[PDB]
Every structure is written in C-alpha cells, then in structure tokens.
Amino acid sequence: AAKNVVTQFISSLSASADVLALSKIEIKLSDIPEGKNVAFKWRGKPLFVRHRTQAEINQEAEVDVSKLRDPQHDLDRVKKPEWVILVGVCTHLGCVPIANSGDFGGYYCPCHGSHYDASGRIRKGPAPYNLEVPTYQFVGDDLVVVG
Amino acid sequence: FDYLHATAFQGTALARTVEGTTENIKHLTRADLASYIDTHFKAPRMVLAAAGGISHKELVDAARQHFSGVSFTYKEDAVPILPRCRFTGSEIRARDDALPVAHVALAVEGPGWADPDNVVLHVANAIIGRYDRTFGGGKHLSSRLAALAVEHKLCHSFQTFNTSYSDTGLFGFHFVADPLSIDDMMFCAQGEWMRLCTSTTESEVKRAKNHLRSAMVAQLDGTTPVCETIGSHLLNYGRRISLEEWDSRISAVDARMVRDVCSKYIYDKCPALAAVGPIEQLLDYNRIRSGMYWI
Amino acid sequence: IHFGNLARVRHIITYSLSPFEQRAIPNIFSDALPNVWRRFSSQVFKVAPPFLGAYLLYSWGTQEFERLKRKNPADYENDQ
Amino acid sequence: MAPNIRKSHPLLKMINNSLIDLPAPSNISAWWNFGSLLAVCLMTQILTGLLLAMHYTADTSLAFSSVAHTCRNVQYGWLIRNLHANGASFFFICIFLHIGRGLYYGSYLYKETWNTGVILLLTLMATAFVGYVLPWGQMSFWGATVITNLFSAIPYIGHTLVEWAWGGFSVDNPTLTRFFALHFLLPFAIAGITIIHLTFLHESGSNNPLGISSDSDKIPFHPYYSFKDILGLTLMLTPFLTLALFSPNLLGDPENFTPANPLVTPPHIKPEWYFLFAYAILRSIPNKLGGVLALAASVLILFLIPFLHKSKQRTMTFRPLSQTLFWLLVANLLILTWIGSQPVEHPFIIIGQMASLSYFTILLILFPTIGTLENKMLNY
Amino acid sequence: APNIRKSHPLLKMINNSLIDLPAPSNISAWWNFGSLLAVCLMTQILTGLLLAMHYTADTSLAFSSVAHTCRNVQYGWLIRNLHANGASFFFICIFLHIGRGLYYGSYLYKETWNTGVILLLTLMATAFVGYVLPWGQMSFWGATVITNLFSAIPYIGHTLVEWAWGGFSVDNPTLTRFFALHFLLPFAIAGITIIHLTFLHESGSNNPLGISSDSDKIPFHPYYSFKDILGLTLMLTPFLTLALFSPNLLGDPENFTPANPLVTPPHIKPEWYFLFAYAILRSIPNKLGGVLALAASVLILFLIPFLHKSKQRTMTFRPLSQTLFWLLVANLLILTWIGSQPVEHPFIIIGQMASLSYFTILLILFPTIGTLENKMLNY
Amino acid sequence: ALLRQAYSALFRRTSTFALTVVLGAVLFERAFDQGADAIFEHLNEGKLWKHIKHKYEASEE
Ligand code: HEM
Ligand code: HEM
Ligand code: HEM
Ligand code: HEM
Numbered sequence A: 001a002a003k004n005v006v007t008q009f010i011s012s013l014s015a016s017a018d019v020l021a022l023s024k025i026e027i028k029l030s031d032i033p034e035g036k037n038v039a040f041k042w043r044g045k046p047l048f049v050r051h052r053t054q055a056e057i058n059q060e061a062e063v064d065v066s067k068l069r070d071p072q073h074d075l076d077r078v079k080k081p082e083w084v085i086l087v088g089v090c091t092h093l094g095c096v097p098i099a100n101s102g103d104f105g106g107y108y109c110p111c112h113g114s115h116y117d118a119s120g121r122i123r124k125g126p127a128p129y130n131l132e133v134p135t136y137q138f139v140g141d142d143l144v145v146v147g
Numbered sequence B: 001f002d003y004l005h006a007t008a009f010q011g012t013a014l015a016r017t018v019e020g021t022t023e024n025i026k027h028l029t030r031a032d033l034a035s036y037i038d039t040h041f042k043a044p045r046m047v048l049a050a051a052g053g054i055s056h057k058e059l060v061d062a063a064r065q066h067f068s069g070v071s072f073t074y075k076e077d078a079v080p081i082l083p084r085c086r087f088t089g090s091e092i093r094a095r096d097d098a099l100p101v102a103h104v105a106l107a108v109e110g111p112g113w114a115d116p117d118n119v120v121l122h123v124a125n126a127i128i129g130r131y132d133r134t135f136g137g138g139k140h141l142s143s144r145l146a147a148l149a150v151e152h153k154l155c156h157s158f159q160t161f162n163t164s165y166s167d168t169g170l171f172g173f174h175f176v177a178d179p180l181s182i183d184d185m186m187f188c189a190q191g192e193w194m195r196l197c198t199s200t201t202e203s204e205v206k207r208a209k210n211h212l213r214s215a216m217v218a219q220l221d222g223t224t225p226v227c228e229t230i231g232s233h234l235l236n237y238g239r240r241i242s243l244e245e246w247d248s249r250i251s252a253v254d255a256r257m258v259r260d261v262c263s264k265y266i267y268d269k270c271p272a273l274a275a276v277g278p279i280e281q282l283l284d285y286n287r288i289r290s291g292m293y294w295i
Numbered sequence C: 001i002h003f004g005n006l007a008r009v010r011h012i013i014t015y016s017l018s019p020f021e022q023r024a025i026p027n028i029f030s031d032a033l034p035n036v037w038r039r040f041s042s043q044v045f046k047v048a049p050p051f052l053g054a055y056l057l058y059s060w061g062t063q064e065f066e067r068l069k070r071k072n073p074a075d076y077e078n079d080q
Numbered sequence D: 001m002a003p004n005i006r007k008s009h010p011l012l013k014m015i016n017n018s019l020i021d022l023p024a025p026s027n028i029s030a031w032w033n034f035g036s037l038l039a040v041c042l043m044t045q046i047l048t049g050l051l052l053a054m055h056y057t058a059d060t061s062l063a064f065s066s067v068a069h070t071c072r073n074v075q076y077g078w079l080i081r082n083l084h085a086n087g088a089s090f091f092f093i094c095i096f097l098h099i100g101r102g103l104y105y106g107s108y109l110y111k112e113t114w115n116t117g118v119i120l121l122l123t124l125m126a127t128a129f130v131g132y133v134l135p136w137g138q139m140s141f142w143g144a145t146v147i148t149n150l151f152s153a154i155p156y157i158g159h160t161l162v163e164w165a166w167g168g169f170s171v172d173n174p175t176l177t178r179f180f181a182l183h184f185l186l187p188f189a190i191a192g193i194t195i196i197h198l199t200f201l202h203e204s205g206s207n208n209p210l211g212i213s214s215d216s217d218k219i220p221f222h223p224y225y226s227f228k229d230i231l232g233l234t235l236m237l238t239p240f241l242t243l244a245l246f247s248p249n250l251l252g253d254p255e256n257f258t259p260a261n262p263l264v265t266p267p268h269i270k271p272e273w274y275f276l277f278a279y280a281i282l283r284s285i286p287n288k289l290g291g292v293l294a295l296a297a298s299v300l301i302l303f304l305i306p307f308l309h310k311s312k313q314r315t316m317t318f319r320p321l322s323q324t325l326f327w328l329l330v331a332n333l334l335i336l337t338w339i340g341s342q343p344v345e346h347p348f349i350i351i352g353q354m355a356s357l358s359y360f361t362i363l364l365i366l367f368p369t370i371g372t373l374e375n376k377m378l379n380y
Numbered sequence E: 001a002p003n004i005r006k007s008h009p010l011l012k013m014i015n016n017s018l019i020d021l022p023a024p025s026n027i028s029a030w031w032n033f034g035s036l037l038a039v040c041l042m043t044q045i046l047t048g049l050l051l052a053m054h055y056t057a058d059t060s061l062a063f064s065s066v067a068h069t070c071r072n073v074q075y076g077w078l079i080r081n082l083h084a085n086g087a088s089f090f091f092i093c094i095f096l097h098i099g100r101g102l103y104y105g106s107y108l109y110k111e112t113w114n115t116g117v118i119l120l121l122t123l124m125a126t127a128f129v130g131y132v133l134p135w136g137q138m139s140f141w142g143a144t145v146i147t148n149l150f151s152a153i154p155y156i157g158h159t160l161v162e163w164a165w166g167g168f169s170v171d172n173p174t175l176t177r178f179f180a181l182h183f184l185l186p187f188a189i190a191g192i193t194i195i196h197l198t199f200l201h202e203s204g205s206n207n208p209l210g211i212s213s214d215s216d217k218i219p220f221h222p223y224y225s226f227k228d229i230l231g232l233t234l235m236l237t238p239f240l241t242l243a244l245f246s247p248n249l250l251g252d253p254e255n256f257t258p259a260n261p262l263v264t265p266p267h268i269k270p271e272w273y274f275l276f277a278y279a280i281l282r283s284i285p286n287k288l289g290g291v292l293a294l295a296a297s298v299l300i301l302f303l304i305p306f307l308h309k310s311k312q313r314t315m316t317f318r319p320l321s322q323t324l325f326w327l328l329v330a331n332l333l334i335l336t337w338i339g340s341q342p343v344e345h346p347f348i349i350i351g352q353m354a355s356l357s358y359f360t361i362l363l364i365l366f367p368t369i370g371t372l373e374n375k376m377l378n379y
Numbered sequence F: 001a002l003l004r005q006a007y008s009a010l011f012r013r014t015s016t017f018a019l020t021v022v023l024g025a026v027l028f029e030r031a032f033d034q035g036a037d038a039i040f041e042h043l044n045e046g047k048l049w050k051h052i053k054h055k056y057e058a059s060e061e
C-alpha cells in the first residue's frame, strides 16, 4: 500500500495528460519538396525540417573550415541524407533564425547577424554553440517523430 | 527469588518454597515427617563426603559399619526420576510503596547441571559480574553494568546468577534500587545481556575466565567447602570434576563461543520477572520482553 | 519524570504471562460473545429509544410532507 | 546526563515523552483513538491539500477548469482530489466522535485541553468553509454568498465588515483568491494549536472511562496504545476509502458540477452534512441577526459545558439518567442535520425550531439539572 | 506556583525564553541578528500573505496580477516593496548572524548550528521560488538556468528535472507548484526556527569573550529586550530608507519585462544574496562540477565545527585568525562582485581564484592557522 | 516444521526479518496485482477495450 500510495503521489507531480500531449510532434517525409523549407512549432520553440536537393551534400558537406568552434561531425548523431532536422532556436539569446535568404545559403538570425549555414551550424556571428539538435528514431519511412 | 521461582515454574514442584506453606507447617504430622525421611533419606540417594586428615579406607569402613539396612526388592535400588517442570515466561509484581527500595529479578530457563554450556554461561556472568555500593573500584570497575550503575547511581546492588537444577535452571540477574532508577537500571542490565549475544570481545572473556578460575578455586577454601562440592558434584554431575578438568573446560571458551551460548538461552526468549516493593517504574512485560533482542 | 510520582499503592500482586505463552483471542465462545451480548443488552434500553424515537418523527415528518403535496379532491367538487 | 538516547536528546525526548513512554490509563477505550486519528487526518489533508494546490488556479475564470483539469489530466489527480474532499468528512466524523466522547466522560474538565479543542474545531470549520469555495461551482459560490451575507445583520459595524471580507460588493474573484490563501493558511494554524492542545493534555494525562484516578494502574503508550491506535486507524480508513473509492460523490451535492453563475440560483442551497445541523439552527430563527447568533452560540456553547457540570462523578458511565439525556441529545443532532437537508416548509420548520430549541435546552438546563438531581439520588 | 508565569504551561514558555531567560551580560550587537532574523520572518510571512491574497499563479496572469496588486490594491505597492526588500533585509541579517557565529565559534553549539544551516538552506530555496512568481524575464530565466543544472546529475538528472518542472521546460505547471512551495516553506522555516531556539536554550548564548558567563548573567528583560528593539530600529531604518526612496535600487529591470521563453535577456544574474554563489557556479566550466561547487559552497558550513583547532573559542584573542576571517569576508565581497559580471577575462580568472581561495580558507588555512596559533600560546 | 524453520532463518535476527519483508513484499506485489487485475477483468468480461480491441486493430479500411 505504502509504496503504491507514494508512487501515486509522486507521479502526481510529473507531467500531466495534456502537457504530455503537446510533448511530441511528427512530420511526414512524403510531402516536403526539394530545396524549399517549412517550419512547424514544437515544445513552444519552432522546429526546422528542410528537404535539400543535392546541392547540400556536395556543396555544404565539403565545407573546408579549419578551427571549428563546436564539435559537429556529420557521422555522430545525424541519420537522414537529403533530410535535416534541428531546433528552430538560435543558441545565442533564443531568437529564431530564418529560411529564405542568407549569406551561406543556409539560415539567418536577424537579431545579431549570426549566419547559419545549410547544415545547422554557426558561421559568421557570435552565437556560441550550434543550433540545438533534438532526438528521434526511425521505424516509419514517410514519418518522423520528435519527442 | 522465591517469587521468581513461583512464577518461573508455576504449577510445578520447582515453584514451591523450601520452607513450605504456612498451613502445612501448622498441620504437618509426626506421620508425614516420618514419611519424608522414610521415603526420601535412602542410601543410593545419598553421599557420604569427607575431606581433611582422613584416609578413604578408614572412612569407607565406618560407613560400612553404620550405613546398614540392606535393600530387598529392586524398587529400593531405583533412583526415582522426577517429572520435569514447565518454564513460563511471565512475571509477578508484589507492590508495596512503603518498602524503602525495590528488588527485581529477571531470568531465562537454564540448561540443567549436566549440559557443559553451563560453564560458558558462567564465563558470561563473570563479564557482567556483580556490584554493591561498597565496591571500591567504583567508576573504574570492569563490568560495564557496574560502572554505569555508578556513573548514574543506577542501583544499590546487582548480581548475575546461574542457578542450575537437575533438569532445568534459572539464568539472569537481580538488582536492588531506589523507586526512581529501577527503569534506567533494568534498561542497562537487559542491555548488557544483549551485548553478550552480539559484541562480546576476547578481552571480556579472557578477563571473565581469569575471574571464574579464581572463583572456582575459591569455593574450595577449607574442608567444609570441599565436602559441599563433592557432596554436590557426585550427587548432581555423577563423577567429581577436578579444578584441572574445570579449568581446561574454561580455557576452551572464547568470545565467539559466548555470543553463541548466550544467544541460545537469552536472545528473543520470554523471561520471568519478579518485582517486589515500590516498583511503579519497572512496568510492562511487553517492553521488558522486547529488551530481549537488538543491541 | 511521569512514572513514579503518581500514587502510593501497597500490597498488590499481579501475575501475567508473556503473549507468546498465552492465547491470542482466548475463549471466543465461553467468555467473549456472552459478554458482547451482556454489554449490548444493558445499553440498548438507553441508546436505542431516542434514536428510534427519531426515526418516527423523520418518518412522520417526511411522510406527512408528501401528503401535503397531493391535491384534495374536495377543493374540486363544484368546478363544473 | 542519561544512559539511553531518547531522554537526553532535546528532540527524541519529545518524540518519546509524548508518544512512547507516555503514561496512559490502562482502561481507555476506542473513544480515545479519535485523538490520533484526528491528527493523522490532518497530516493527510494538508498533504493532499498541497498536492492539489500545486495544480489549482485561484481565479473566477479558471478555478473550475483547473480543478477539472486536475482530475482529468494530473496523474492520480482524481484520486488525490477525492481523498481530500472525502478527507474533509472523515475529519469531521472523527472530530464529532472525539467531541462526543469528551462530553460523555467529562474530559471537558480538562478546561484548557478542552478550550483549545473548541478553537481547533472552530478553525477546522472555517477552514472547510473556504476550501469549499475554491472549486467555484454553483454550491461553492452560493454557499459563500448565503453565509458571508449573514454578517450584514450585525448593526452598523457589519454592513462594512462584509464588503471588506469580499474585497468587493459581492462574492467575486477578490474573494476567491483571498479564500484560497486562507485555506492554505488555516490548516497550519490547526497543526499549531493541535500542539498546544496535546500539551495541556500531557499536563494531566488521559481521562479514563471510569472517571477515577488511573495512577493506580497506567500503561506505556507503546505498544499498548500505539498498536490500538493503528488498528483504530484501519477500522476507519476502510469505509473512508470504501466510500471514496466506490461512491465518490455519495456525499457531495451535484449543483457543484455546474460552474458558478451569480445570475442563477440553485434550487436548493444546502452545505455538506457536517454543517447541516448548524444550517438547520440558523434557518430556524426568522431574523438574519437572531439566526446568526443561534448559529454562533450553537457551536460557541461548547465553551460553557465545563461550567455546566454538576455531578459529583465525572463520566456518565455510572449515571443512567444523564446517559439517555446524552443520547437524546445526540439523536437531537441527527434530527437537526436532517432538518437542515430539507426546505423551509411545514412540517420541517416547526420540527426545526423545536429541535434547535431542545438542543440548547439540554446543554443549558437539563444536563446541569439532571446532574444535580442525580447527585441527590446517590444521597450526596 | 506563586506567580502565574512559571505554573502556566503557556506563560512558562513566553517567560522562560524571553523574560527570565539567563543571558550573558556581555553579548554585543552581533547577537541582535537573532531576534531580527525572527522578526524578519514574522514580517515576510505577513506581507507575503497580504500579497498572496491578490496574486494569481498563472503564466498568463502572474505578471499582470503583481502589477495590479501594485496599481490597484490599497497600499498594495507598499506591501509589495516591503516584501521584496524584506527578502534582502532577511539575508543581510542572516549573513551577519552567520558571520558572527563564525567569529565567535558559536558553531560549537553543534545542533543550534546545523539547525541554523538548514534554516538558511530553506530560506535560500524559499526566495528562489518567490522570485519566479512575478514571472518576469529574470523570473523565468533564473528558473530555467538553475533548474537546468540538475540535468548534470547522471541518470536521474533529466528525470529529476522534467519532474520538477511538471513538463519539459519551466512553464505554468512549474509556476503554480512554485507558488505553493513559496506559500509553504516560510512556515517550515518558522517551524525549524523553534527547534533552533530550543537547542540554543540548552546551553545559553555564547559570549564575545568565549568563557563561562555563569559568573555573571543578566535577565533577557529588560537588558536584551531593550537592546533588541533598538537593534531593530537601527536596521529597519535603512531597510525602509531604501524601500521608500530607492525601491528598485537592488532589483534588476529585465524583470519589468513579462517573461518570454523565446528571447533571452542580455545578462542573467540573480539578486545580490545569490551572487557569491552564482560566481562560484560559473567559475567551474562543467555543469556538474559547478553544481557541486555551488552545493558545497554552502553545504561546507556543516563542516565548520569539525574544523576548529584553537584551544580558545572566539577569535577575540587570536589576531591571526581574525585577519584570515576578514580576508574571507572580503573574499565573499569579491565573489559577489565577480558574479554581477559576465564571463570574460579578467573576471573569469579572478572568479576561479576567489572561489579557490574561499574553500581553501575554510578548509586549510583556518584549521591550520588555528593549530599554529595554539602553539604560539605554548599549548 | 515451517513455523520453526521460519522463526529461525527468517523472523529471528531483526536483520533477516526486515530483509524478508522487503523481498517478501516484492513477491506479494508482483503477484497480488496479477490476481487482482485478473479478478477484476473477469468480472467485466468483454466490456474492456482490452477485449473489444481486436475489432479495429489491423482489421479495417
Ligand atoms: C484540531 C483537532 C484535534 C486534534 C487533532 C485532537 C487530538 C487529540 C489527541 C491526540 C488527544 C489525546 C487522545 C484522545 O483523543 O483522547 C486529544 C484529547 C482531547 N481532546 Fe482533542 N483533538 C482535537 C480536537 C478537539 C476538539 C474540537 C475538542 C473538543 C472541544 C477536543 C477535546 C479533547 C479533550 C477534552 C481531550 C481529553 C481526552 C481525554 O478525555 O482523555 N479536542 N485530542
Ligand atoms: C484543514 C485541512 C483541510 C481541510 C479540512 C480542507 C478541506 C477542503 C475542502 C472542504 C475542499 C472542497 C473540496 C471539494 O471540492 O469537494 C478543499 C479543496 C481544496 N483544498 Fe483543502 N482542505 C484542507 C487542507 C488543505 C491544504 C492544507 C491545502 C493546501 C495548503 C488545501 C488546498 C485545497 C485546494 C487546492 C482545494 C481546491 C480544489 C479542490 O476542491 O480539490 N486544502 N479543501
Ligand atoms: C532561520 C533564521 C534564523 C533565525 C530566525 C535565528 C535566530 C536565532 C536567535 C533568535 C538566536 C539567539 C540570539 C543570537 O542571535 O545570538 C540564534 C542563535 C544562533 N543561531 Fe540562529 N537563527 C537563524 C538562522 C541561523 C543560521 C543560518 C545559522 C548559521 C548556520 C545560525 C546559527 C546560530 C548560532 C550558532 C547561534 C548561537 C548564537 C550564540 O553564539 O550565542 N542561526 N539564532
Ligand atoms: C521566507 C520568507 C519569504 C521570503 C524569503 C519571500 C521572498 C519573496 C521573494 C524572493 C519574492 C519575489 C519578490 C519580487 O518580485 O521581487 C516574493 C514574492 C512573493 N511572495 Fe514571498 N517570501 C516570503 C514569504 C512569503 C509568504 C509566507 C507568502 C505567502 C504564503 C509569500 C507570497 C509571495 C507572493 C504573492 C509573491 C509574488 C508577488 C510579488 O512578487 O509581490 N511570500 N517573496
């Protein structure tokens, strides 16, 4: 009884039915066109998921930049090929980058200038770490779940 | 002690006073008095013991001369075996707040003369020893229960005892004390008892042994005290145990051995309690009972 | 200190036995129940009465309330 | 200083000399368990109380929805809620038995312990009263209004006391919020006093069913009463859970499942059973002011009880006459309760006034009188 | 009993603790912080409720309610100031109180001490939650930065955190539970404070000289009751003086901007009383380490008693220790300052050093200079 | 002689005692729930979604 009543009250403080609902958001990998980018909304902060043509695994995958200020290797925790998902939040002060233009063809946070390449990394700007990267899994091809 | 017995055994022969009832004394008869001697004082059930400047021979003879009356049947040759007595964890409390001090006796069922462990049990009792307000060592004494009894004025006196009977026995302690320290005292006592079954050291035993040795030797200081032993040894043990035997039986004991024997007869056992006097503070067997484990 | 100052008591003996030596709920029939009844018996004629005496008032009170809701055909014997 | 470690420790000496070595009569009955129960009860309400408060939003536009969310979204939220609302009842039951007991054994001769008791009750009563408004349901709302509106019967110094209490001109947000704060507070104040209560008690020890010196034979609280106490706990906790797990709303009126609406009034406005008896007395006197007084005194009267003891003996055990008068009284409360769950139409009303009329009459005239008369039959 | 304050199970507690209480005759002003600390609590709690009666714990009304409380409630603004500043007044008093006990080895009153420490811990936690309530930028972010440290604890980190938030980030579920917590804790403090005073009355007050006062003790009243009230006024003045003429002197402005999880304030820095700690946290680059440093930075206190080597108690007669003590105090000032500054040179190096010296003093110097001190007395 | 054997290896030392309750309780839970759940469900045969699930789980559209 004790153990139970206590578990009962303790799980009481953990997340509730509703907050666990907006917990995750899924994205269909079979409705996004090449190049063009579309942003959603996750755990409050926007989420970026772009479908790159082929000028991003050959143009922005060969980028030759010596002293990199953040351990971002494309074989650590990055599955999807023509696919790239990342937190829509500039790791600086929390601002939200863009997806239209840009210097390195990637993104652009008009808050302080920080230029984010088309790979989810800081280039010409202050911002310390690189755009936060979320967790996920693969069991459904035309489907991805973040949360 | 009497009250102790009377509840410790209750409904058994051992629960009787050696002085008998007040009624019995009033009405016993030339008859019954005869009968006792008659039925009880019989040769096989007797031992002629002697010690001093006497040769076994000479003695043995005189005996052959007066210890006549030869037995016909076979019944007169048969040593009557006694129906054993039931030990009962209980208590009897005789309250009289007009009594100056209070007495308390706590005990557990014993093993009986035969059983060897009686030796260990004694070695144990040697560790908790005894005390009265006139011991001089006072706060420096070695018996933890003693010392404390001084550090806090726990009692007046206390003693560990290992009464042994043919088929049974009473193991415990008895202390006298003021109406307001009974508790603390008891507490500490039951405590020490516990420590016995749990963390007795080789220092405690080595000391207890050297004490016991002196104590045994001591019982044989004179002629009277020797015949007593012999009168007993034979009658009870069968043979006669020499200081050489005893001693070795003692040198064999170690800490480990004690913790095991005390545990055996002490740990989690329902005890007998005799409270007499202004005992308003001893109270609750239940509590007293629980003091029989963990320490 | 609350155990000792209480009162002056003399010449009283009490004998009791360890729980382990005696029975848990002894003589349920020969002693228990008979007393459970005795007790019950003795009090009933004290307690019960007014409680019962209330059930009535509750009943009448309630019962009578309903009755005052139903219409009295006598109000309508000449409404032709 | 001392041998063991629970008499020489300025803390264990308080967890001991109050719950383990504590001198207890050897003959106290089940009517003495309510003490600890009442405590344990508190220990729980406060806990479930917080657990809820951690999900509640005190605001006339979210109170209802929050409570609802608490039930439908929070893990075991619903469970935690039930327990709290029902814990309320369980609380009162235990208090009423506790109180009755004291009356039937003249425990009230322990003046302080008694008066602290009464206060404790008062606080408990107020406490619930506010806690009821929180869910802001129809009944929540209206119960607030009906009651708080009584204060306006006081002359001059009241028509204001009310608008002050509301923080406005009617029961509204300003109120809700302050009530919530109050509901968070009072429980603690109860716990506090409860400490003082038990202290004045430990100044004399427990009274026993016979009403004669226990010194001749007292037992240690542990394990005797600690064990008894826990059994007592289970023997209650059972129905408490039983009702709260199989018939949740058996007790609670439904109109409180309808979000409060100041514009529409519920068919019948009636409190939770434990306030019924009082409600009935309030409504017996037609005159806001009088009824108010009757309500007040209906509970305040308790303070008088001590000064209204005439028997040469303490407990009613050996006083048959008093006993039935006592049970007549008890039943007299049952009735008042019932009368309170009914409207204001004949016969109810008349039955109402009578019951209340007899309630006071007993505690004021019979009890003390039958007491005296009792004494003379013993030839004292 | 003859009179009626020794035979009354209640007045016997309002007396034997505040009127007939045996007090040294030589205790100084560093002993007033005791009562002040108390009175302080008595007040915060009161102003605390008064506010709570107009507050609405909700990520969509918390800010606006606090604002309303200030703009609409009678003396609401007043009541608010007093509370927010009362917070400071509280800490100042606690810090003096604490230092005092260090400089006079009051910590040899083991229990009284440890209870003290706890009381502080509780107070600290208490404020921390109270800060989030107004749900302003700093409110929000302060929450996030700190609470986010817990995730450094391997395994149970992530778990413990999302539990603490009631979600995945500091949000309503949190606000509300914090409010509840802020309503509770003060009482818990009052509670322990009782126990604190109890273990104290088990030995009586320690005196500046550090030698048996039994030879000459005076009755708390009127000696210290009077002294105490004076002490109160000599403090209450600046407390009111700042809270009535410079309200926000202490408080950062970013908390006048309704919290927004999307944008982060330029600089996230706590109230002065947490600064010293903040500075130690950030000195260590490694969330986990910095967390530990923070913890121990305050937990260390518990060790103090077991770190006394002088044959004497108070530092009054130990010049060497004294300066080491003052070096320490100043060492805190610095840490404080370092905390109100960003993470750029020189600050960072100065930071790591200060912290490094903070522990080194309480861990090695103090106990060593103590021993060495003893031998100079030839003991 | 279980009572004996029990009092010896289990209920004797306040240590093995406790140790028993722990483990013992573990078993109790693990198997009390099963029984309870099972009993409960049985008394509600075919009313729970655990039952009527087969009608939409991989058998429609
Ligand atoms: C705030 C809740 C209260 C708590 C938690 C509480 C608790 C207790 C406790 C623990 C006891 C000792 C055991 C026993 O019940 O006999 C006690 C005794 C007592 N309480 Fe209360 N009590 C409460 C309310 C009250 C109330 C409202 C009254 C009545 C006005 C009261 C009157 C008494 C009396 C007279 C005793 C003496 C018991 C005896 O006769 O031995 N208490 N209470
Ligand atoms: C003195 C003990 C307590 C009593 C007697 C009590 C009683 C109640 C009552 C009468 C209700 C109405 C319940 C319903 O909707 O049916 C309630 C609700 C509530 N109580 Fe308490 N309460 C107690 C303690 C607490 C405490 C200590 C807190 C937290 C400090 C608390 C917080 C709440 C909350 C959040 C609600 C409103 C939501 C709900 O109804 O569930 N309660 N309480
Ligand atoms: C919760 C807030 C606290 C309150 C209200 C409080 C109150 C008091 C009071 C009234 C005194 C007696 C007079 C005096 O100040 O010397 C006292 C003494 C003491 N307190 Fe606190 N205290 C608190 C926190 C602490 C803290 C955090 C510490 C340090 C860990 C502490 C350590 C002590 C010590 C060592 C004494 C002994 C004073 C002496 O040397 O005579 N107290 N406290
Ligand atoms: C331990 C004593 C207390 C401390 C240390 C304390 C501290 C604080 C702090 C740090 C704040 C933020 C103030 C600001 O906005 O600058 C605050 C706010 C608040 N406190 Fe307390 N508080 C205490 C007691 C209480 C109590 C007892 C309550 C009521 C149970 C309470 C209710 C509130 C409310 C309503 C707020 C939020 C609105 C506001 O900031 O004015 N506080 N408190």
Ligand SMILES: CO/N=C(/C(=O)OC)c1ccccc1COc1cc(C)c(I)cc1C
Residues within 6 Å of the ligand: D125, D126, D128, D129, D130, D132, D133, D139, D140, D142, D143, D144, D146, D147, D269, D270, D271, D272, D275, D276, D278, D279, D280, D282, D299
């Ligand atoms: C806010 O209203 N709460 C009510 C309640 O029953 O809460 C538990 C309630 C609901 C409907 C009608 C009247 C009330 C309050 O009535 C009360 C409240 C108190 C204190 C007492 I003394 C006496 C009465 C009659």
Ligand SMILES: CO/N=C(/C(=O)OC)c1ccccc1COc1cc(C)c(I)cc1C
Residues within 6 Å of the ligand: E124, E125, E127, E128, E129, E131, E132, E138, E139, E141, E142, E143, E145, E146, E268, E269, E270, E271, E274, E275, E277, E278, E281, E298
């Ligand atoms: C909710 O954030 N509250 C803050 C505050 O200063 O409240 C008074 C706050 C604001 C900005 C940054 C960090 C904090 C909390 O900082 C704390 C809080 C505590 C407890 C400790 I130990 C140590 C530190 C460094």
Ligand code: FES
Residues within 6 Å of the ligand: A090, A091, A092, A093, A094, A095, A096, A109, A110, A111, A112, A113, A114, A125, A127
């Ligand atoms: S927040 Fe994006 S560059 Fe500063």
Ligand SMILES: [Zn+2]
Residues within 6 Å of the ligand: D253, D254, D255, D268
């Ligand atoms: Zn209804």
Ligand SMILES: [Zn+2]
Residues within 6 Å of the ligand: E252, E253, E254, E267
């Ligand atoms: Zn700023």
